[PDB]
Ligand binder design. Structure first.
Ligand code: HEM
Ligand SMILES: O=c1c2cc(F)ccc2nc(-n2cncn2)n1-c1ccc(Cl)cc1Cl
Length: 528
């Protein structure tokens, strides 16, 4: 054998003397083969959930996942059931589909999984520091407690006329509408809905100063910060290219603006309750006694607005697109508007919004068929055992939960692919805890997360903007419905979703034709 141990040696030297043709050829075929072999070996573990097969190492199933994630999920579900892992741009994602999925990931022990470990690389470049996913979970919990303290029923009662004012101003002044000079037109909902979202959100959460700056060049900074919030930040987070530093410019620029306004409200004492900025100023002292720096506060503002911008605008687009081919639902929604607002002689209020169940059902149903975030991740911190199986999810893996996939399942939603607001009759609540509650720092929320309809997640990371979004979407749709009818151009229909972005947007252009319900109606106020 010693004459073979000489030969491993010899053979080794001859490898180092291959032409660079075969050397490069080998540095690609050696890893390709080991990859394929490791998988076959992997499939013989019985404490591991089935791993989706793939050819290209590191990249894994990222193509099909990234492009059509629900269909990926469905085919995986058919060959392996509800638990399966797949590889994604260097990471291993264990997907648990269905309500026990929600349970296993949303109700995971703090010690078992990390949300900030998963998200901070995407969000921190964008929002700034010391906030959201750039702090310990405990801090997050109190930050949510803060924000949510400006998301009160009385807050909502002041925001509603402000939001309405913005919609009306938008109809009057935007080149997309100009209702005072045109009775009909075509809009890209993907153009209109983002401006409407930022305008209304800005004016209400950030106040009238901050809204006004959007009428200037300053608005482009929101657009710059916007582009840095993209999945590419997951694999290539900081690359010395130009989109990355207009991003960082904007983060600095916008944050500075808030601090400018923050500090000068304190150097006066223009501290009321008008907006979230007032609120966070009066209310951002942690339980251990620390106060949020002005910088942190501002970064928390950026985060809050960013999160409500994309989800809400997408939902707003989808509502318009689904209704554009359902003049019966527009008709139904309009009658409810007339009955609740007494033919329009009542002014819209947060209270009156709550008495529009069909309106809220449309929001509800849209959020069902078009959940904004098709995937939520965690990273596993301790080996997790999955009941009732032999599976251990080893630390360093990622768990992926996808309530939006469950939303589109016939098992839990009869005719799941049919837009039907009436599947929610006598049931228009944004959401409700259907049993016992629990509190993590920002208020009592559902303890069980087994509801097959989970648009806002659950557990410690559960959303806190649900009521803001229904408020915004409510006022928005109330006014669209009372002002306009709208339909598709010839042979157009509901676009299919673009899953590749951070949010599941419709595939643009998604155009609708509007026409005034009342051609001779003039929106008041003044423009130049
Ligand atoms: C249609 C609108 C929205 C939908 C469908 C939605 C959905 C969600 C979901 C699924 C989560 C949980 C994320 C996870 O567990 O990994 C979440 C979290 C959160 N959302 Fe929303 N959201 C919406 C709007 C908003 C708005 C308007 C705001 C703020 C004004 C907001 C702020 C937040 C915050 C602060 C969290 C906490 C995240 C954490 O603790 O990790 N969201 N949202
Ligand atoms: O970062 C994320 C986020 C990151 C992901 F990788 C996936 C989904 C996400 N979903 C949300 N949102 C949930 N509601 C609104 N946005 N946020 C997020 C969470 C909290 C805040 Cl303040 C802002 C954002 Cl964008």
């Amino acid at each position: 054998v010693g004459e073979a141990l000489e030969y491993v040696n010899i053979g080794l030297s001859h490898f180092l003397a291959l032409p660079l043709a075969q050397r490069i050829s080998l540095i690609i075929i050696i890893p390709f083969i080991y990859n394929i072999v490791w998988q076959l070996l992997y499939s013989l573990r019985k404490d591991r959930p089935p791993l989706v097969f793939y050819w290209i190492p590191w990249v894994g199933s990222a193509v099909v996942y990234g492009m059509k994630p629900y269909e990926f999920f469905e085919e995986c579900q058919k060959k392996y059931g509800d638990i399966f892992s797949f590889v994604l741009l260097g990471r291993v994602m264990t997907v648990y589909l269905g309500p026990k999925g929600h349970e296993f990931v949303f109700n995971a022990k703090l010690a078992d999984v990390s949300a900030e470990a998963a998200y901070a690389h995407l969000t921190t470049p964008v929002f700034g520091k010391g906030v959201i996913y750039d702090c310990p979970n405990s801090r997050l919990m109190e930050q949510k407690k803060f924000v949510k303290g400006a998301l009160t029923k009385e807050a909502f009662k002041s925001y509603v006329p402000l939001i309405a004012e913005e919609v009306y101003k938008y109809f009057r002044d935007s080149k997309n509408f100009r209702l005072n000079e045109r009775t009909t037109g075509t809009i890209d909902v993907m153009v209109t809905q983002p401006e409407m979202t930022i305008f209304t959100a800005s004016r209400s959460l950030l106040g009238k100063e901050m809204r006004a700056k959007l009428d200037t060049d300053f608005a482009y900074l929101y657009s710059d910060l916007d582009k840095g919030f993209t999945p590419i930040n997951f694999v290539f987070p900081n690359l010395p290219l130009e989109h990355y530093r207009k991003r960082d410019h904007a983060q600095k620029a916008i944050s500075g603006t808030y601090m400018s306004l923050i500090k000068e409200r304190r150097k006066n004492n223009d501290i009321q309750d008008r907006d979230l900025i007032d609120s966070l100023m009066k209310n951002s002292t942690y339980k251990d006694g620390v106060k949020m720096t002005d910088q942190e506060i501002a970064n928390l503002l950026i985060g809050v607005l960013m999160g409500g911008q994309h989800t809400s605008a997408a939902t707003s687009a989808w509502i318009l697109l689904h209704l554009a081919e359902r003049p019966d639902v527009q008709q139904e929604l309009y009658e409810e508007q007339m009955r609740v607002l007494d033919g329009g002689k009542k002014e819209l209020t947060y209270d009156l919004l709550q008495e529009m169940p069909l309106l809220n059902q449309t929001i509800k149903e849209t959020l069902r068929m078009h959940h904004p975030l098709h995937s939520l991740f965690r990273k596993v911190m301790k080996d997790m055992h999955v009941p009732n199986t032999s599976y251990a999810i080893p630390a360093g893996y990622h768990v992926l939960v996808s309530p939006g996939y469950t939303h589109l399942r016939d098992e839990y939603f009869p005719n799941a692919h049919q837009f039907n607001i009436h599947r929610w009759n006598n049931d228009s609540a944004s959401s409700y805890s259907v049993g016992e509650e629990v509190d993590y720092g920002f208020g009592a929320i559902s303890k069980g997360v087994s509801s097959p309809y989970l648009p806002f997640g659950g557990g410690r990371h559960r959303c806190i903007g649900e009521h803001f979004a229904y408020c915004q979407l409510g006022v928005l749709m109330s006014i669209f419905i009372r002002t306009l009818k709208w339909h598709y151009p010839e042979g157009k229909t509901v676009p299919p979703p673009d899953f590749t972005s951070m949010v599941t947007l419709p595939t643009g252009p998604a155009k609708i034709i509007w026409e005034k319900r009342n051609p001779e109606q003039k929106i008041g106020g003044r423009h130049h």
